Amino acid sequence: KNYTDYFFDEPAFDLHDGGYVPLEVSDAPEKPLNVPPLLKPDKETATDVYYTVTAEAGETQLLPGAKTKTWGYNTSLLGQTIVYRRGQHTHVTLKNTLPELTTFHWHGANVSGPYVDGGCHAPVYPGESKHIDFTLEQPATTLWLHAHPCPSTAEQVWHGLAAMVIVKDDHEASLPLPRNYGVDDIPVILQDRRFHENNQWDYRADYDPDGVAGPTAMINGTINPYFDVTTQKVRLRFLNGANRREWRLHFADDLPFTQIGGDGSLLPEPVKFTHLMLTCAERAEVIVDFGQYHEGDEVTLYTDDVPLLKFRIHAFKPDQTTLPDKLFDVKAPVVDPALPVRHVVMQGMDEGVAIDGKKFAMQRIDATQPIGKAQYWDVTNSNDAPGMVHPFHVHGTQFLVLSRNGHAPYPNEHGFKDTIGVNPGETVRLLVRFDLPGVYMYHCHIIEHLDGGMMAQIETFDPAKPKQEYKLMDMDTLMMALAKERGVKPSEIWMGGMQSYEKMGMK
Template identity: 40%
Template sequence: MKSKLLIASLLVGAIIMGGCSAGNSESNNNSNMDHSTMSSMDHSNMSDEEMKNMEGMDNKDNSMENGHASHNNPLALNNSTGENELALPPIIEPKNGIVDITAQQGTTEILKGTKTETYGYNGSFLGPVIRIHKDQTVTFRTKNALSEPTTFHWHGLEIPGNGDGGPHQVLEPGVTEDVNFTVNQGASTLWFHPHPEGATAEQVYKGLAGLIYIDDENSQKINLPNEYGVNDFPLVFQDRQFTEEKQLNYQAVLNEDGTIGDTLLINGTVNPKLTVGKEKIRLRLLNGSNARNYTFKLNNGATFQQIATDGGFLNQPTDMKEITLTPGERAEVIVDFSKMDDKTDIALINEEGITLLPFKIEQKAASTSNIAQKLNDFGVTEEEKTLPVTKKLELFGMGTMVSINGSQFDMNRIDFTQKQGDTEIWEIYNKPDMMGGMTHPFHIHGTQFKIVSIDGKEPPLNLKGWKDTVSVEAGQTVKLAVKFNNKGIYMFHCHVLEHEENGMMGQVEVK
């Protein structure tokens, strides 16, 4: 029986793991390419049996048991019953220029009547919203109160490499370290999470994640909803799978190609609802899951407006019917509840029609002011459009055998170099293999980049903004204009956390 389960798991695993692929035979044809030490490897001619054997080397025998039949048809989420009001993280701001942030462990009553062992920042589960301002000089005073090493990675923040919190900057238990920097980017919704080599996925799964809001003069002038908890709400989406004991046992549910759960938590709240007024409401969406993609829409088919991407505002509000975010991506949207019937059930749903977040509309004083039609002055320059590609990244593999340009992550190897302040064009190609492939969220530390093209075409309007994580579908080629304003060593990787940990990550040194 055990052998039958193993064979079944390997067969399903081969289907699941088939997406982490890329390759481009042209990568050696440009003498200006920065290949550094990354080698080229073509796995596309592997047989089915070889593909299965790759996955079977190290993969846990649980892909069948946990229902992870496919990332294109993932384990279904529960419908939110709306019985619990959405929890809101506390806001903390610098005091005398210092923000204290402690990674700690504890217990949290996520499911009624049970204490679940969890991790959190400044609390037992998840973390606060850190609010800072452009041009402000701040110190993040980080402390590790866990019983294991961790790091503090500031996802989307332009920061010197020695403060970025990648796997180089490990804090041992009991250690406190100051991260000093000046905020040099515009208004945006960023986030922070751990990034220790080999433990990122599990630490995030247990609860280490928080938000960073950057404000600037522009954001205070463009008449956006900005009253926290009244018309401006953070929404951190994460899926989890609880054991029979209602615990978060990551090792029991680990899937080497991306761990997916059936229970949705928003801001750590199970079965949430959000009470809003009949006014324009700003929702700051973060996909904080290990691997699941989310497509968000309203159940009544209403249009909403996207106003921001990962790293800042779009040039103008953009009408949308739905928006998809892969792990690590953010978006800000405006929903106009003043036009909706408060007696009608309104909810945020996913592409399968699963109710993610029901809204309760109250008849209370509403702001009816109009949002500015000009939010930003963002654009890809003509020069950036004509720059040659100098870095090509070829993703390939499955499960524990993922790679970039044929190599797995090595902390002692610098894969690319780039000069501080120079803009280069990075080309990311997700080559489908015999199993069809899957979408990869590609993230670069320490910078906000511009999407120049997707398969040779301009990106859609809602992607014409600053990004630090970009969704690359199987078979797609994405070109990015990348500039680093600080020096240091930065990671680039797939933000499916299990892919990152299994080696789909590299390093660029900015000099």
């Protein structure tokens, strides 16, 4: 069964918005796709690994001309790919060499909150170093790292603070999958940007409370990239790292491809596609087979009508292996019947975005859930048609998708996920279990909605113990710091998201 059409509701696609910015094919000369190097551990044994992850500012040649000023992890733009291993004790030094405070959020990592999680409440101030330790007990998958100050996440991701995280385990290592990182297994971080004069980025001037989208696609920090294919089979780790844009991916000739992984795990079984849509923060790992091409051939990957990435076919050794019927055993957590079904409503667009009738307040806990107890969450997008698809994300968990409007989830949604696109009028039922105590956000992952208040937080707790005290960030602390850091008055700070709060008269 080859899936030839996008699963999401077509009327709600981003391309029907009034302020939709179409992608334009840039002038710049085609060049080799940048593949971020693997971050070298400071030290590694079988049981332990030590990393230093460093947020920093620099400049990057993106367009011919001047260099674009950028932020990155251990590099000028984006980051070096970080490798974690299930069961391995991980030690990370978070180092901020930026002019402003930041946060290090491990999107999709089953870690304690709110500090290791690295959300709103885990500031790392300029010049400061912080130490975190954790052991991941979750399946092999593609995660990512990104800035998460509340606000502005949108500004820091725009400036380039995102990096791929690969999680390895024993089960995945036993499978006949391409796995030579940089040769037949590559990141495909999908982003867009708007270049101004001097090829600079200017988030404020491009700002839009409903989502910032620029006309120039940028793949792993590359304009008009090509990839030299030297194997028959190639594994693409797609990440939608855009502020808002949806990617509607397909190849020339309707070349099929097989999705083998989603956000939080391998899919139970491989799923064949010709067309695949990804909302913000979603990952899809796919295998593309170039067996039916000759050397010299060129194969174009598209989003809608726009070429993104060209694959140049070189000589390759024939690959005889085929995927097994079942890739991964999904073990569903059990739900206590005594628990309520949690109902979470996403509402509004533009400056009016909200969850359950209110915007995020960094001091206010919106919900609680005992650890180790799975609960059904019904997540609804209140928008009426046309509306937009909101990608709903929950920190600190990987959930299963049980249903969409009482019917089957999409074909590629039978594994573990941390982000799900919710269509106008739709209720998605999720099975959500938190393994660790802490404070965790849940929010739309259109990053301007996130900053604009479409976010809430849940305290997970051990019932055996009393309520734990967490030092939560407050808005005065954040603005004091940004004021000092930017060398300006607390009253003349500008942050992405402020406009949403102020226009709605909310704090």
